[PDB]
Design a protein around this ligand. Structure first.
Ligand SMILES: Nc1ncnc2c1ncn2[C@@H]1O[C@@H]2COP(=O)(O)O[C@H]2[C@H]1O
Ligand SMILES: Nc1ncnc2c1ncn2[C@@H]1O[C@@H]2COP(=O)(O)O[C@H]2[C@H]1O
Ligand SMILES: [Br-]
Ligand SMILES: [Br-]
Ligand SMILES: [Br-]
Ligand SMILES: [Br-]
Ligand SMILES: [Br-]
Ligand SMILES: [Br-]
Ligand SMILES: [Br-]
Ligand SMILES: [Br-]
Ligand SMILES: [Br-]
Ligand SMILES: [Br-]
Ligand SMILES: [Br-]
Ligand SMILES: [Br-]
Ligand SMILES: [Br-]
Ligand SMILES: [Br-]
Ligand SMILES: [Br-]
Ligand SMILES: [Br-]
Lengths: 133, 133
């Protein structure tokens, strides 16, 4: 973990209220695991039918989930959780509605997060069910 | 270590250039140990001749060291290190020149920082030496 990326992540995680449920020790683990990325408007982040090995948190800007009736997800939202939970391919294509700042979490670290915080794990599980059905 | 105080310290620490010399592991150590406090304009932070068991880093505003020819210390500066280095009482009264935002580091944590960072330990010693007499 490089200093620059580490320090920058603290500013970025502040835009994701969900992480307010994590104590200091857990926050550090997550900050060390998260990867920051900026995606230009229009780019495809997750493509329907493809294998998924990571999930994302929106920091700034918004993404569009290409469901029959598209769903725009904004700052603080997360996506790409379904493939990690179910093991199934991406359920829908997600693209940048506007230029978007994201924080990504690989599967191994997603598992760590869920075990470190059962409450956050429940939010992921229930939200995925809402989206699934 | 309060969750709120912990997350709040990251942006406060960013205002102190000295800490740019610290890596992730040590940054977490200092963020956990530092105590944030605001001091109103004119108030005494440490009084000459009094025992000292902590030092301070200025985040916002400025303080005034009451040496024969007063010395102003603005954002990023530190003071109160001499009592920690020498074991002697405060060498001068330091007061808030304007309302000031500070980060306090207790003796035990100051020792930890010096062990964790030889470069910073040297800066403290050299600075204290230069300021003394
Ligand atoms: N109905 C829906 N509403 C909002 N987001 C959805 C919906 N269906 C899928 N998504 C998201 O888009 C992602 C596609 O990848 P995943 O299947 O891994 O996880 C998905 C969710 O995060
Ligand atoms: N000449 C000086 N210039 C800048 N700061 C000083 C000077 N003399 C004392 N100080 C500071 O004011 C503090 C008074 O407390 P300390 O003696 O513990 O440590 C001191 C320094 O941080
Ligand atoms: Br920790
Ligand atoms: Br992906
Ligand atoms: Br699911
Ligand atoms: Br990732
Ligand atoms: Br990524
Ligand atoms: Br910083
Ligand atoms: Br380190
Ligand atoms: Br750590
Ligand atoms: Br204190
Ligand atoms: Br005053
Ligand atoms: Br006061
Ligand atoms: Br008094
Ligand atoms: Br004091
Ligand atoms: Br200022
Ligand atoms: Br000294
Ligand atoms: Br005086």
């Amino acid at each position: 973990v490089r200093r620059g990326d580490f320090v920058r992540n603290w500013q970025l995680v502040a835009a994701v209220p969900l992480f307010q449920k994590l104590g200091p020790a857990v926050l550090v683990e997550i900050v060390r695991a998260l990867r920051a990325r900026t995606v230009p408007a229009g780019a495809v982040i997750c493509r329907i039918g493809e294998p998924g090995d990571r999930m994302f948190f929106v920091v700034e800007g918004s993404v569009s989930v290409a469901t029959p009736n598209p769903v725009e997800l904004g700052p603080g939202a997360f996506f790409g959780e379904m493939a990690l939970i179910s093991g199934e391919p991406r359920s829908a294509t997600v693209s940048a509605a506007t230029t978007v700042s994201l924080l990504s979490l690989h599967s191994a670290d997603f598992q760590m997060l869920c075990s470190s915080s059962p409450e956050i794990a429940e939010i992921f599980r229930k939200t995925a069910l809402e989206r699934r059905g």
